[PDB]
Structure formats: C-alpha cells, structure tokens
Amino acid sequence: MKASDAVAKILADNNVLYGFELIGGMITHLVDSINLLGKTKLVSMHHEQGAAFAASAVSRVTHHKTLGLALATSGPGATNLITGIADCWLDSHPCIFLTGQVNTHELKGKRDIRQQGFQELDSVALVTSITKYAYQIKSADELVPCLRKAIQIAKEGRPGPVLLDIPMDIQRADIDEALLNIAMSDLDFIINKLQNAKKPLLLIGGGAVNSSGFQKWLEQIELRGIPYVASLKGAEKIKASDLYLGMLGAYGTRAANHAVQNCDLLLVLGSRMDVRQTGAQPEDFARNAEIIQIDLQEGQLNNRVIADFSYQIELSEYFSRFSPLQIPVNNDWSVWTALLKEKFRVTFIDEYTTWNLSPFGLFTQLNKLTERVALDYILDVGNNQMWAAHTLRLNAQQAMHHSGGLGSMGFAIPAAIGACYAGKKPIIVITGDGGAQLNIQELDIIARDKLPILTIVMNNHSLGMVRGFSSTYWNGYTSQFKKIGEAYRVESKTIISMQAFSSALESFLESPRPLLLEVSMSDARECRPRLEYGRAIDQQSPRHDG
Amino acid sequence: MKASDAVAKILADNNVLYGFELIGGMITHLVDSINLLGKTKLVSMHHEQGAAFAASAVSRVTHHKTLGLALATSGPGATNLITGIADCWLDSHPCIFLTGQVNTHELKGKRDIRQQGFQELDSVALVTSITKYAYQIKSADELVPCLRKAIQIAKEGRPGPVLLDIPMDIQRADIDEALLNNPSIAMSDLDFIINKLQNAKKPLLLIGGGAVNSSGFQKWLEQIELRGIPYVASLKGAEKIKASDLYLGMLGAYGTRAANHAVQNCDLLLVLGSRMDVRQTGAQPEDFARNAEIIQIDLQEGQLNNRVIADFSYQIELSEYFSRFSPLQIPVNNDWSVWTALLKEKFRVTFIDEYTTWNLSPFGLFTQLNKLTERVALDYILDVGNNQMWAAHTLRLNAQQAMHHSGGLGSMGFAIPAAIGACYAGKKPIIVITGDGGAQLNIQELDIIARDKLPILTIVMNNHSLGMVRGFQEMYFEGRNSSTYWNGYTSQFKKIGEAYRVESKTIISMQAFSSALESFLESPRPLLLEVSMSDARECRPRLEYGRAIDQQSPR
Numbered sequence A: 001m002k003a004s005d006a007v008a009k010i011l012a013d014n015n016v017l018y019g020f021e022l023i024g025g026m027i028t029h030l031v032d033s034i035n036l037l038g039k040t041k042l043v044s045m046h047h048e049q050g051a052a053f054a055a056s057a058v059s060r061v062t063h064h065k066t067l068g069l070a071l072a073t074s075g076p077g078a079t080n081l082i083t084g085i086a087d088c089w090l091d092s093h094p095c096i097f098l099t100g101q102v103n104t105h106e107l108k109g110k111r112d113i114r115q116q117g118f119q120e121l122d123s124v125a126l127v128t129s130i131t132k133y134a135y136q137i138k139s140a141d142e143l144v145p146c147l148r149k150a151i152q153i154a155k156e157g158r159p160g161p162v163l164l165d166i167p168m169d170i171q172r173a174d175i176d177e178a179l180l181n182i183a184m185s186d187l188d189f190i191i192n193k194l195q196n197a198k199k200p201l202l203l204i205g206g207g208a209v210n211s212s213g214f215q216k217w218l219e220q221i222e223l224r225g226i227p228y229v230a231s232l233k234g235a236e237k238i239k240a241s242d243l244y245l246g247m248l249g250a251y252g253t254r255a256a257n258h259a260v261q262n263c264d265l266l267l268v269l270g271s272r273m274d275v276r277q278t279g280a281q282p283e284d285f286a287r288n289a290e291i292i293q294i295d296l297q298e299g300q301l302n303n304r305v306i307a308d309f310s311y312q313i314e315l316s317e318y319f320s321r322f323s324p325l326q327i328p329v330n331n332d333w334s335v336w337t338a339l340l341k342e343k344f345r346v347t348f349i350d351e352y353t354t355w356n357l358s359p360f361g362l363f364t365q366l367n368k369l370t371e372r373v374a375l376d377y378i379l380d381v382g383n384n385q386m387w388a389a390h391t392l393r394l395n396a397q398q399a400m401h402h403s404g405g406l407g408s409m410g411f412a413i414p415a416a417i418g419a420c421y422a423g424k425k426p427i428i429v430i431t432g433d434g435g436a437q438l439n440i441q442e443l444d445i446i447a448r449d450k451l452p453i454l455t456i457v458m459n460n461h462s463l464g465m466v467r468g469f470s471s472t473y474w475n476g477y478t479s480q481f482k483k484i485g486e487a488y489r490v491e492s493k494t495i496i497s498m499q500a501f502s503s504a505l506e507s508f509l510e511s512p513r514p515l516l517l518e519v520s521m522s523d524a525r526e527c528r529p530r531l532e533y534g535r536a537i538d539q540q541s542p543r544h545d546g
Numbered sequence B: 001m002k003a004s005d006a007v008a009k010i011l012a013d014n015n016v017l018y019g020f021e022l023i024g025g026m027i028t029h030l031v032d033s034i035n036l037l038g039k040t041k042l043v044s045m046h047h048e049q050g051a052a053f054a055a056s057a058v059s060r061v062t063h064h065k066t067l068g069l070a071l072a073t074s075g076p077g078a079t080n081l082i083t084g085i086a087d088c089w090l091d092s093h094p095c096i097f098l099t100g101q102v103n104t105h106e107l108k109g110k111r112d113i114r115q116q117g118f119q120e121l122d123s124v125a126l127v128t129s130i131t132k133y134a135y136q137i138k139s140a141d142e143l144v145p146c147l148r149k150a151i152q153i154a155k156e157g158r159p160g161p162v163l164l165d166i167p168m169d170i171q172r173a174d175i176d177e178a179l180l181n182n183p184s185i186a187m188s189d190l191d192f193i194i195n196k197l198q199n200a201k202k203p204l205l206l207i208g209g210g211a212v213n214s215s216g217f218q219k220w221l222e223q224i225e226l227r228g229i230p231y232v233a234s235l236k237g238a239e240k241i242k243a244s245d246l247y248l249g250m251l252g253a254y255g256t257r258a259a260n261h262a263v264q265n266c267d268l269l270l271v272l273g274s275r276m277d278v279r280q281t282g283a284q285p286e287d288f289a290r291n292a293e294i295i296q297i298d299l300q301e302g303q304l305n306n307r308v309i310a311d312f313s314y315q316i317e318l319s320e321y322f323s324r325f326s327p328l329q330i331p332v333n334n335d336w337s338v339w340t341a342l343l344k345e346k347f348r349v350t351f352i353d354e355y356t357t358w359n360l361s362p363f364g365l366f367t368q369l370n371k372l373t374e375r376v377a378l379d380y381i382l383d384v385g386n387n388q389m390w391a392a393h394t395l396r397l398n399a400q401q402a403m404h405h406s407g408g409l410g411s412m413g414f415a416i417p418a419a420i421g422a423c424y425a426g427k428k429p430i431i432v433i434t435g436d437g438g439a440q441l442n443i444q445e446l447d448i449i450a451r452d453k454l455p456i457l458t459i460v461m462n463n464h465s466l467g468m469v470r471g472f473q474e475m476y477f478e479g480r481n482s483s484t485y486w487n488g489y490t491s492q493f494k495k496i497g498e499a500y501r502v503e504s505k506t507i508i509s510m511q512a513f514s515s516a517l518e519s520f521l522e523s524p525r526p527l528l529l530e531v532s533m534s535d536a537r538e539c540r541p542r543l544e545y546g547r548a549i550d551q552q553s554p555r
C-alpha cells in the first residue's frame, strides 16, 4: 500500500477526523490520500497559522475526544504553523501536525550549507522545544509505527502537540499492509480533610476539565454542596451554577477571589497556580486555608504555591478512584455556600455603568439570550478576552475557548472554523480590533463554507490591555471591520447601542449564518475588576467592590 | 544609563535605522527608549510576521548598507517572527530581531514545567537553527557586548539574521555608560582565473546572490561590461542587475531561454556567489554548462563542490575578490564580439510573448512595467507563485530599480509587508506584485499602507487559483485540484483594498492597466489593482523536470 494511503488510514482509525491545510508540493500526496479515503474532513485555509489554530480547536471543542490535524509544506508552511503548535503546547491540547519535506536524497544532511533542496527547512529543529514528540521519518518502514506512537503521545497524560516531518519520497513509497494490520491512604487523607473543613473550596484547573469523568465527578461535588472556582482553563468547561463562583485571579470575579482567600481548605485539581491565578504574592494564596494540590507533573507541584499536601495523580484516575459521595454529608457547609452565593449576588454586577456600552451588559445579554442554545464562544487576547472570561456564565451545552498560556492574538477567528467543523454547532467569536487583524483573511473561509460563526469585534480603537499599562493608540484611527466583513462576503453590521446588539444577536440565534458585528467601544479600555500594585487577589481595583 | 536606552543608542550607532513592531508588555521599555532617542524609526504593524518581513526589506532595499529591526514580545510575538527570520536566513540578508522576555526570576529555567511566567517561551530554542547568532541575556553586563557582537555577526561574511532575547528586568537595569563608550587569497589563483577568462572564446558570468550586495559589485560589473563579457544571474543575483545587452536575464527552470542558451554554450563559466541549486541547474547538474570549464567562487566551503562540481573552486569573499581583481586587467579577446552579438540576437528572438492566446499576457504586463517606469526610481516586491516567476523572467530593471524575492524559503505573504519596509528605508515608491493566494496571508498590512500614506502600488494578479501547485496537481494527480481551485470562487481584492481605505481598481484590459500605472507614477500613493487573470495558470518558459536547462517547455 502507498505510504500516504497508510497515513490516511491511520489518522482516521485514531480519531483524527478534521484537518486544515494550505497546500504545497510536498504535501500533495498526503492531501490526496486523505481526501480519497474521505474519513478525515480536510479544509483549505489561507494561512498555515490559521490552519494550525483551526486544527487546535478540534480537540478543544470536543473536550479531547477527537483530534485535529494541520498539514503544511516544508519551509514557510512549517514556520507558519508555529504559533498554533506553541498554543497547543502551553494549554496542553492534543493536535497532530504533519509537514511534508523534500526528498530524502535532497536533504542537506550534515553538509555546511543553509539548505540543499528547494524550500528545505528542518521543521523538527524548529518545534522540538514546543512539542511532546517531533521526528523526521528516515525510512518508509518507520512511518506507520512512528505515526501511531505520535498520536498516542499527543493524547496521553498531559496532552499536547506532536509533529512528523515526512519526506516526499517516503510519502510515495510502499509500506507492508500485513504489518500495518495511587495510595488508598492518600485518597482517604484527602477525604478526611474535606470532611472536617468548615469552608471547603475547589480550584478546578485545566488538567481536570478535559479528563474523562470530570462532569460526572463534579455532579457529585454539587450533591455534597461543595463550592468551587476555576482558572481560565478550567472555566472554559464549567456550566453556571450557584456553587460555581467563576474564574479566580487577576481578572477573576470578586466573589471567586473572596472564596479563595476565606476558605479553610482549598483542593486544587490540575492548576499551575501561575501568576495570573495568584497575583504577585503566591505566599498569600488561600491565606486561611490548608492547600492540597493534585497534578500529574511533579514539576508543577511545589512550584509557585507550595501546597500543604501534594499528590502526583493523573486526574481521570483520581475521578474513577474517588467518588465525592464518599465524603460524609455535612450541613455546616450550607452557611458557607449561602455566604458565597450572597457575595456573588452583590459583587457580580456592572462596574462600567458610566461607559456608553458596558462589557458586563454585553456579556450578560449573551448569557441571557443564548440560555437555550448549544454554542461555543472563542475568545481572542486583550481586555475583550478578560471581559468575557469574567462575565460569561455558560449554559448547559456551551463552552468557551482561550489561548491561556501563550495568549496569542489572532487565535479566535481561525479557531472558530475548527470549532464549528468539529463541534457541529454555532460559534460566537469575540475579538478586539487589534486581534481581529492578524488572521482577518480567514473570514473568507467562513463565507466560502457558509459557517454559522458570529464574529463580534469589540472595537475600542486601541491595543487596550497594553495601552492601559504611541504603539497602542493612533488618535482614534481604526480599520472599518464592518466593511472588511462585507468585502469578504460576510453579512456585517455596525453596532452602536445595546438595542442594536440585542437585535443582531437575536437574528443570529434565529438563523445562524456568517455574521460580523463591529461594536463601537472607544471608551472601553480597561477591565474591572483587575489586580494592581502587587496586591492580594481579594484586593482588586477599583477598590472595595468599586 | 538605563539598559533599554543603551540598546537604542547601540542600534542607531550601527546603522539599524528602521524597526517594525507589534507591541507587548515585555517590549515597552525597548520601544519607549527607541522612540525617545528618535534615530531609529519604529513603525507599528498588525502582525509580527509582517513586522519581520518589513524589517528584512530594510537591508534588501539598501543593498545591505542599512539594517532593519523587528521587535516582539515573548511567546506569540516571537513565534510570529519565525517565517521572516527563516527568509533572512535562507536568502542571507542581515536583520536584527529583539524579543522581550519575562523577568529573569520568572523564567522556568530547568524546571520540568512547560512555562513559568505569563507568556514565557524560549525564543532562542525556536530560532537557533535559522540564525547566525541567538542568545538570551543572563546579566545586564552582557547586553552591550552581546548586542554589538550580534549586529557584527549579522552583517559579516555571508549575512543573516540574529536574535537577542532580553528579560524585562535586564531592560530596566543600569549599565556602565563609560564602558559603552570605551583562508588567504593566492595571487596565483587570481592570475589563473584571469588567464582562463582571457583565453576563453565564449566567456560567461553567473552572478549570484553572494555577489550583488557585496561592496564594490556595481563598479566591478561596469568594468566587465567595458571588456564586453556577457552574464546571466540567479534569481537572487537578478534582483540587483540593470537591464543591458550583455545581461541575458535569469537562468534556470523559469529563466530566459537566452540565459539558459548562454550557459549551455559558453566555454568558460565564472560563478560568483551562487549555490547552483536545483532551480538554477534543473535535475541534471552533471549537464550544467556542458561545453564549459566552470570556476566557482564562494565564501563557504560547503557551497563549493556541492551539486555542481566546478573544474576550479576558490574560497574567496566576494567584496575582497572585487577589489583584488579589476576586470580591466583582462586582455580583450577578439572572438568575444561575435559571441556577445550571437547572444544579443538569441535574446532578441526568444525574449518574446509566449502567451499570445491568453486574455492578458504576463509578458505584456511586465514589458509595460519596464517601459512605463523607465525614468522612475522604484523597486518591485514579488510574492510566491506563477506570478513571481512571470516577474522574475520578464522584469528588465531600469537604472535605480531593484526587485526583491523570497528565493530560498519562497514564503507566500512576503510581498505586501516587505513593501512597507522597502518603502520606509528606500524612500522611494514600491510596486508589489502578488497572487491571489499570497495576497491573503498578510492582507491586514494594507491598513498600514493606508494609515502611513505610503506610495505603494499593490498589483494582485488574480487567476482564481493557487496556480503553481494547481499545475502540479493537473499533471501528476489527474486533475484532482480541490486544494488549489474552488470552481472560480475568489475574494474581492478591489473591495478588500477599499475596506482598508486604499484606492482600488479592477483591471480587465491592457489599457486599464496602463492607465492605472500612469496614474500611480504621476502621483505615487496607496493604490491596489486587481488584475483579472483566470486563464493565466502557468509559466512559459518552464522546465519539465529531468530535462536540461536549454530544453524548456513549451518546446
């Protein structure tokens, strides 16, 4: 069997079901074999960076059940993937990257030249620091096992991206078809700490939410009445609930941060407790609590926040080994969770009442109007992203998606293409004016493929998050996003008022379809709450619930 | 002195005079220090990839006399630079890259974690394989000497890109100001080469990328012309060579039929800084210049005795060669006039429109560019695809004109942002030619052209296809072109230009093209032309591979 046909077969048999590409000579055999088999849907995009973001959104939107694929040619194709690869690496989402390479006999090998073949570039050397596995196939007999290995590595433990570099001659070669075809005492210790806490709280992180069994385990936590907060990456997958206080940290809800600083036991499930979660005083994190941290990765234990008790456990195993129903029922906790609900009621409010359009009002309207609609949100990077992270309260079949660790602007629009294809559901993008520019060209794909993606551009005529902290502001100069959308054949609307916003959103939900909204937000250049001056996480600005 | 202020001073004192950035928290101190000194002009762009291509165009448009700078924040800023870095690496153009990093005490170091600080990413590890020098500053006392070293390394020998990664705390540190202020050539080899030239009946030069940006090249070429010796060039050499009766054009797969004829009939080929890669020689390097003895001069031992094994190979840096060897010391051979007349005639009869049955001939479009811009100082920037090779073949540069290609890397999306750098540093109008595919990648930088009122004409040759690959798929996959052709579906480039506030025009005919060019040349200003070219999906001549370079198709 032809090697490229074997690659197509292996991808489809291992749940790599959606791929994204910009073509080049060195991947024609792969693309052709994939399209012919027709089990993996391959979508053409205008920039391999866009392809990489779309591919990453496949595992994101399917909660790691299905993997994405990005294909690129050697040289500039491979170098164009890199931002996306790095996002998958820093947020631990699985994704497959295949680069086509020049013929093995055209490689420079060890010769002291910068390149030998046309458009030759070693992609492995570029991505070794940001992948779980990166290898260039040397002989056609390595291809099948190495691809199977790479896919297994992407998915396993702490997930992430993998890359195989495949010389064109190997793609065309024949392969052999026949050869193709925890301590119970630790668990108990944690239970006992939970049982005896007067004010327990979970911190749900990125390591928890995409691990098998998570939502069923959380249902049992709710049955026991234990409240919780989440990191940005945990928050992506958590439905709104009275026991869920929202995201913690610098931009987190005042209520979530209050809970963290007043709990007597904090159980941290797969969170790095990085500077965005803790602020500049990790010593002060959960100051009234004993902290338990569970993580698969020893290096992420005893790091910034030194937990009182640290356990190296993979979380899907933890969830199958520990039912929260084994925690004795405790009615002391009702007073605590009532206290937190009331804190949320009184502090989860509009802090932008003197702005022309409040971000809190916009996101409150999204929460309300989409209550019975299965859709996901994709966020870009900037103040706009944090407006969303704070205020989005996800309804039953809704997730939101962020570039958290890397924080790459330009993620959202192309990611929405992948999310829509793999999630088979409408998508709402929120992006800022700066971030919208980077992969604006992929609006063409949204139009071409008639995808039900609503793109909301929150235009504050500034690179807002850095402007607050010459190179971020141009005296009100801005691009015409409504006109850019229309130029790309996407129905577009200028949104000046809450009525216009609400009407446009209703229209989209009634008849999902390519739509772009340019929201005029010149006075909206900060987040409230926010954390300043090295302060504790329960001292967000504006001061005192400000 | 504040470290970032020192960095600003050092850049300006070493001819790093134009920079391009997308801001981030970890480069605010560097950007502020640069703007406050005001000797290096820093221009904001929408994508660090665009910034990188723009920065690269600074040395390109100034023939390596002035260097460009791209600044980016750690993490996605740095990863967005990479395509531009790789272009500078494979085409050997000098350029400085500075990335701002998290505070030294927030780095992950050797801890087994993927990151520690917010947006922390090791940029050095990403670019070590595609730079001459890449280093992360560890102590503020290293910054000044390392930056000076990096700039030196970028410029020297075979040029290229360098990167320094600078932690924010180091940018804010004090440095000591007072301290801030504080093989051989053989004559016998030169003579041997002179003797080979003087006794050749049919001499030819191959002028490569290593020659044309080396100091003294144009004055040396003037003397070659005085002696009446003809020459061809690689794509990278062709960037900088003025049209002349002795210059037969670019050689190779897409080169002129006349240039390829000259190479295969000369009796001595003197190769000056060319790799003689597959695009120059085709698939039979053993047949390259079959009637000639070949002399190759290169700085890099690894690029000698490589694909084409020269009869005589010399490791010499070309600026030294050009000073050590005046072509005036070659005696004229009396057979040369017959040979150069033969080649001029070959050029006359073969440098011809091969697309007479197309609605718009690329050859006609580029010959109109040659004619209409005859007395105008401007540069061309090309993207990647059939459109790029139409330009490489047919452009005949007038006196103060150059063209610029992504040759080794061949990165689509180069042209539009490169034009921004070229325009700023070259202080001259720029004409971009890009295909419909290539135009998309960094389309967002049209906004910068409009914002800054730059005299850049963007010509989109829209054949509704990813043409150069579409042909590959026709010939080898039985017409299965779903990833290069979408049944005529296309973007509206005229409307996209207008949306970005760039005056735009649809161009259907040669008259419209000519009128629009005349308008641009009369009043240079942001302008976009969408040229409708649905039937234009191949290059002629081309090499259908395996064949010798003098049997291009169509035959």
Ligand SMILES: Cc1cc2nc3c(=O)[nH]c(=O)nc-3n(C[C@H](O)[C@H](O)[C@H](O)COP(=O)(O)OP(=O)(O)OC[C@H]3O[C@@H](n4cnc5c(N)ncnc54)[C@H](O)[C@@H]3O)c2cc1C
Pocket: A090, A091, A092, A157, A158, A159, A204, A205, A206, A207, A208, A211, A230, A231, A232, A233, A234, A247, A248, A249, A250, A251, A252, A269, A270, A271, A272, A273, A274, A276, A277, A294, A295, A296, A297, A300, A313, A314, A315, A316, A381, A382, A385, A386, A403, A404, A405, A406, A407, A408, B118
């Ligand atoms: C502009 C901006 C502002 C931000 N503001 C905030 C903010 O205010 N608050 C906030 O929370 N974030 C914020 N972020 C996001 C932040 O940078 C981090 O991306 C995020 O907080 C990390 O979440 P995490 O540690 O839960 O998940 P990850 O980064 O995914 O870390 C996962 C952790 O769990 C472990 N793990 C993974 N899989 C498993 C498994 N199977 N079993 C066991 N352990 C596992 C890993 O080893 C690691 O320790 C911001 C980002 C940006 C760009």
Ligand SMILES: Cc1cc2nc3c(=O)[nH]c(=O)nc-3n(C[C@H](O)[C@H](O)[C@H](O)COP(=O)(O)OP(=O)(O)OC[C@H]3O[C@@H](n4cnc5c(N)ncnc54)[C@H](O)[C@@H]3O)c2cc1C
Pocket: A118, B090, B091, B092, B157, B158, B159, B207, B208, B209, B210, B211, B214, B233, B234, B235, B236, B237, B250, B251, B252, B253, B254, B255, B272, B273, B274, B275, B276, B277, B279, B280, B297, B298, B299, B300, B303, B316, B317, B318, B319, B384, B385, B388, B389, B406, B407, B408, B409, B410, B411
């Ligand atoms: C779509 C496409 C089609 C192409 N078609 C063609 C084609 O038809 N014909 C063609 O010619 N190219 C073609 N190219 C370009 C090709 O890929 C190479 O980029 C090009 O041929 C390299 O030219 P070069 O070797 O002269 O320059 P470089 O790649 O820059 O190599 C420079 C050489 O000179 C040496 N050198 C550098 N500086 C010095 C110095 N100071 N002193 C001494 N030696 C020095 C280097 O060591 C090296 O060997 C194409 C590219 C693309 C993207």
Ligand SMILES: Cc1ncc(C[n+]2csc(CCOP(=O)(O)OP(=O)(O)O)c2C)c(N)n1
Pocket: A380, A381, A382, A383, A384, A385, A407, A408, A409, A431, A432, A433, A434, A435, A436, A458, A460, A462, A463, A464, A465, A466, B022, B023, B024, B025, B048, B073, B076, B077, B080
């Ligand atoms: C590729 C990249 N370069 C730079 C940054 C740094 N940065 C963080 S937020 C931000 C501003 C984003 O502005 P915009 O998209 O308009 O959003 P706003 O903050 O205004 O809502 C920038 C430049 C980034 N995250 N990604």
Ligand SMILES: Cc1ncc(C[n+]2csc(CCOP(=O)(O)OP(=O)(O)O)c2C)c(N)n1
Pocket: A022, A023, A024, A025, A073, A076, A077, A080, B383, B384, B385, B386, B387, B388, B410, B411, B412, B413, B434, B435, B436, B437, B438, B439, B461, B463, B465, B466, B467, B468, B469
């Ligand atoms: C970034 C990048 N990805 C992929 C390729 C491979 N490739 C070479 S030419 C080409 C098609 C170019 O299409 P277009 O820009 O429309 O030019 P045309 O050949 O049709 O004139 C592609 C995809 C490339 N060179 N650069």
Ligand SMILES: [Mg+2]
Pocket: A382, A432, A433, A434, A458, A459, A460, A461, A462, A463, A464
């Ligand atoms: Mg903004």
Ligand SMILES: [Mg+2]
Pocket: B385, B435, B436, B437, B461, B462, B463, B464, B465, B466, B467
């Ligand atoms: Mg095209």
